[PDB]
Design a protein around this ligand. Structure first.
Ligand SMILES: Cn1nc(-c2ccccn2)cc1NC(=O)c1nc(C2CC2)ccc1Nc1cncnc1
Ligand SMILES: [Mg+2]
Ligand SMILES: [Zn+2]
Length: 314
């Protein structure tokens, strides 16, 4: 066989939840295949269809500041770490589908929210009236699968193929944060009451959804310098959106207004308390070995407090 291998530093550190995939774009396909060979197995996908599918996916990500090809691989790496430290809980189809869902989850993102598409009257908002962007990301995933030499799920049965596409579809839709609030409430109650059942498909669906939120936000779970530099990239997109809102003659919400640059630390504080902490808390409860995502979220929360109190710069 041919195994994929990484330099010694990468081979060890890719196992830590807080691994940063680095600034060399040409290493990222290599890193993703390695993660698939170790979580799934070297037999899950024909290497030549994978390589062709990966490079077609890369080509349909845009060069936007945050929702880009580096984000896709970073989210997949977080899923890799959740999957490797909970290896007894997931099926063969789920390992296969969820890494792929993560790589494809923001395909053809232009840096604008579902709200902007609705106010702009983008054609996609008439096609898909809710989770607009997320339904487009899936649709693009399907397009690429249906290119010649690109069906990585060729070896699967007719009914398996349909299950793995349903796993991918729900996983991608679950990255609509407007759906996370509801999904986290439900999982919290089910966990506190004792009803949560990993053999119930609609319960599996909710947990995978929560893993997808955790993976999608995992930028708040990195070493402080990575988390701080990554917040520049997200605000660059938010502020460009708020400018386009103002051009429609609409006041953007505060997080998208570049005039409120100085309230960024206070907004981060808001985001960690209302969203990130709850998220990593509930995921730790359901999946104890994902502890370090919560620990590292709390540490960066503590860092943002330092920034507000003038004991840190940004
Ligand atoms: C709710 N909210 N309010 C403010 C705010 C409010 C007022 C003033 C200034 N900012 C900012 C935000 N959201 C995020 O910061 C944020 N959102 C999202 C998902 C799109 C939702 C993902 C990540 C986020 N952060 C982040 C990402 N990657 C590294 N580090 C941090
Ligand atoms: Mg998205
Ligand atoms: Zn994303």
């Amino acid at each position: 066989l041919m195994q994929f291998t990484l330099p010694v530093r990468l081979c060890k550190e890719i196992e830590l939840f807080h691994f940063d995939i680095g600034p060399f774009e040409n290493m990222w396909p290599g890193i993703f295949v390695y993660m698939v060979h170790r979580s799934c197995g070297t037999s899950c996908f024909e290497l030549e269809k994978l390589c062709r599918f990966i490079m077609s996916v890369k080509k349909n990500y845009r060069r936007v500041p945050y929702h880009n090809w580096k984000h896709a691989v970073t989210v997949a790496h977080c899923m890799y770490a959740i999957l490797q430290n909970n290896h007894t809980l997931f099926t063969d189809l789920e390992r296969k589908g969820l890494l792929i869902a993560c790589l494809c989850h923001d395909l053809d993102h232009r840096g604008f929210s579902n709200s902007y598409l609705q106010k702009f009257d983008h054609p996609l908002a008439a096609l898909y009236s809710t989770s607009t962007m997320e339904q487009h990301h899936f649709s693009q995933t399907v397009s690429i699968l249906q290119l010649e030499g690109h069906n990585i799920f060729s070896t699967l049965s007719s009914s398996e193929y349909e299950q793995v596409l349903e796993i991918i579809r729900k996983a991608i839709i679950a990255t609509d944060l407007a759906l996370y609030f509801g999904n986290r409430k439900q999982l919290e109650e089910m966990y506190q009451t004792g009803s949560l059942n990993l053999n119930n498909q609609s319960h599996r669906d909710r947990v995978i959804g929560l893993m997808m939120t955790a993976c999608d936000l995992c930028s708040v779970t990195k070493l402080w310098p990575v988390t701080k530099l990554t917040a520049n990239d997200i605000y660059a997109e938010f502020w460009a959106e708020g400018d386009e809102m103002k051009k429609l003659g609409i006041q953007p919400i505060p997080m998208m207004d570049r005039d409120k640059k100085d309230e960024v630390p206070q907004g981060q504080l808001g985001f960690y308390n209302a969203v990130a902490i709850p998220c990593y808390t509930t995921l730790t409860q359901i999946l104890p070995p994902t502890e370090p995502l919560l620990k590292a979220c709390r540490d960066n929360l503590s860092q943002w407090e330092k920034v507000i109190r003038g004991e840190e710069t940004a």
